[PDB]
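Title: [Solved] arylamine N-acyltransferase 3D structure

Original question kept below for reference.
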Amino acid sequence: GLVPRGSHMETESLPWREYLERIGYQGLLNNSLECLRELYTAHLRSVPYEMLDSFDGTPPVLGHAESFAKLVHRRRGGNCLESTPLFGEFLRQAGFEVRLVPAQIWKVSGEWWDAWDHLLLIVTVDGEDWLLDVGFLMLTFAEPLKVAEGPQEQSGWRFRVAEEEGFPTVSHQGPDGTWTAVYRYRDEPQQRADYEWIIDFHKSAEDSPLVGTLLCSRNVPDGKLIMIGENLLHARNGRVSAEFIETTSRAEELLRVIFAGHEHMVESAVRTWEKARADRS
Ligand SMILES: CCCCC/C=C/C(=O)SCCNC(C)=O
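Solution (posted by the thread starter after getting help):
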């Protein structure tokens, strides 16, 4: 084009009308908390988490205009580098007070991932801070999480923010009653230049989890469907259940739900599921 890439001019004339169409929000906007809640739900329900293009090791491009093109025009899915900053930029231009902050994810094994490679939004409405995450693979909060003390109930799950070992830590209350971390964050506002390093980290990583694997998920009302390789986690109204996917037929049934409304991604996703299952046998 004639408008240089990365310029404030490029990101300022992005057609947000088409973005709200992409995430299925055909209403009026104001800056109330109720509008924030509906935008967040719309994005979570409309955009699946998918890392398909990086199965290669091919990195994402980071521009707002490039995320916008992939997500809005090609109607691809999202993740923490391609969805969350763009959503934060849209909210900024719609008048919300928004801050992008880095996070570190808690492994199922029971430890932190080595890098602080997640991103989160904090939105300030009427002098309260609200957490937002539109780029997370597994189970997190589907309504904005108040940065305040004590359990917060959502869809039969209990979430909380609490200061643990010096960091605000988002946890989830398990079936027993014990709490498990989802991730911790730092209140350190990020720009593109501050989280760029993440691409190099996974490029130069031995065995990055976002390369050579199948990772996708979809919020549904009251839960989420998460596919990790040959496993499916179905979170529904305070319960999670697990199923081992045995046949490509079965994986394709499930990928059609996860990618409902995104039928153009199913073949690629089914190919990736087979190529990933093979490459661990
Ligand atoms: C350059 C190819 C790979 C893309 C780089 C990573 C992107 C992300 O989405 S980083 C969040 C990853 N999640 C955990 C637990 O590490």
